[PDB]
Subunit: 126 residues, 3 copies
């Protein structure tokens, strides 16, 4: 009744590097929201920036129970940050609409990385 | 509120080593009867075993006891709902124990990358 | 009841070794609480001990939304264990007070390790 779903994702930087090589310059544009893409050039570690967002979006998609499908899409799931640096989700309008319809009230996020591994942790509440 | 949380990471190489030590009987000791029905057809059997092992260890940590008593590999079953979300199903001894503790719902998420399988579990009371 | 925040951390044992090597015992003196620092000489696996505490404290600081800041400090975030071995937090008095001011009622902890990777997950409620 409290938790709608939980999600975790572990993403290797190597995996992101291979995807970015395979799909070329267009890859970032397929995984990132327009806001994320606008701020990507200022990332200190671009590969890590993509990997974190990739992991966060997959973990989100698990926490809401559907996987990447329909409105639960890379382009609709954006990661932003509050004034203290805490990561938080911001949604394309098709996804905020879907979330309200599912009764999902809020979705929390945490991320970490170490060496070649990025980790995301998501909890969706009712 | 939350009763507890649990997490576990499992090496695919480790599961391989455990298979060699105990033979195919290892799977018979980690998996439930229902899991054992589809296990012979599993396309990636090391990954299949690793996921179940990690999930069951995480479950055991999330209920605060570890693998002990009714909290045992053979009582902790993983299934999936219609959309592919993993979810737990319990043997009778474990389902009773959980309810005795007031634990109402246990949620599960799994991920894997290269050699690492990761499970995270939240038990709610 | 609701979630205040969630936190995760992954920590490499090799990174801990590097940190011990550069700073010597001053690293443990910076990360451990006075209580933990007294029992550290008895840890059967001092690198694994420091790694778990480091990951748990970092995940804690994320779960309360601040990072390491103010009273949310390494020296105020302690790890103990209950009778069955379940890990749990204890707090320096200033942090206990802050948690109470914030309405945080319970912070849950889980840890795991495999090979070089130590992992911590934390959920702060209310
Ligand atoms: C779930 C998803 C986000 C990721 O799948 P993945 O990263 O390949 O798989 P992971 O190893 O991280 O985790 C898989 C686990 O997800 C979990 N999962 C699957 N479907 C799920 C769902 N609907 N809800 C919650 N969890 C789910 C399962 O536990 C699965 O492991 P199991 O089946 O062995 O239990 C999926 O929705 C997807 O579409 N992946 C492809 C993403 C993609 O498009 N990449 C290309 C970039 S353009
Ligand atoms: C605790 C257990 C669940 C996991 O053992 P493990 O995998 O070695 O433990 P992990 O390394 O995953 O995580 C260790 C952490 O578990 C946590 N933990 C221990 N007991 C716990 C408990 N009762 N409740 C919650 N968390 C617990 C602790 O934080 C511990 O690390 P710390 O003591 O350093 O803080 C154990 O009971 C277990 O089941 N081991 C293997 C089971 C087995 O039989 N394997 C052979 C195949 S038959
Ligand atoms: C938050 C903190 C713990 C980050 O730890 P880290 O190991 O540097 O970085 P990790 O990769 O583990 O985690 C980084 C993520 O923490 C998260 N984070 C940052 N500020 C946060 C906050 N206020 N609340 C919650 N999460 C936060 C972000 O998601 C960040 O990644 P992003 O910016 O790419 O989104 C760190 O910034 C901090 O606040 N204090 C550490 C200072 C310190 O003492 N270092 C060691 C000295 S021995």
């Amino acid at each position: 009744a409290m938790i709608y779903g939980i999600g975790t994702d572990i993403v290797s930087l190597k995996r992101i590097i291979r995807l970015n090589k395979k799909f070329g310059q267009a890859f970032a544009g397929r995984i990132l929201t327009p806001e994320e893409l606008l701020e990507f050039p200022q990332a200190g570690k671009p590969v890590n920036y993509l990997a974190k967002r990739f992991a966060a979006k997959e973990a989100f998609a698990k926490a809401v129970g559907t996987g990447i499908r329909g409105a639960v899409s890379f382009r609709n799931i954006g990661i932003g940050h509050d004034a203290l640096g805490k990561p938080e989700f911001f949604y394309g309008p098709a996804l905020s609409k879907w979330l309200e319809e599912q009764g999902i009230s809020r979705v929390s996020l945490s991320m970490s990385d170490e060496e070649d591994t990025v980790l995301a942790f998501v909890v969706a509440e009712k």
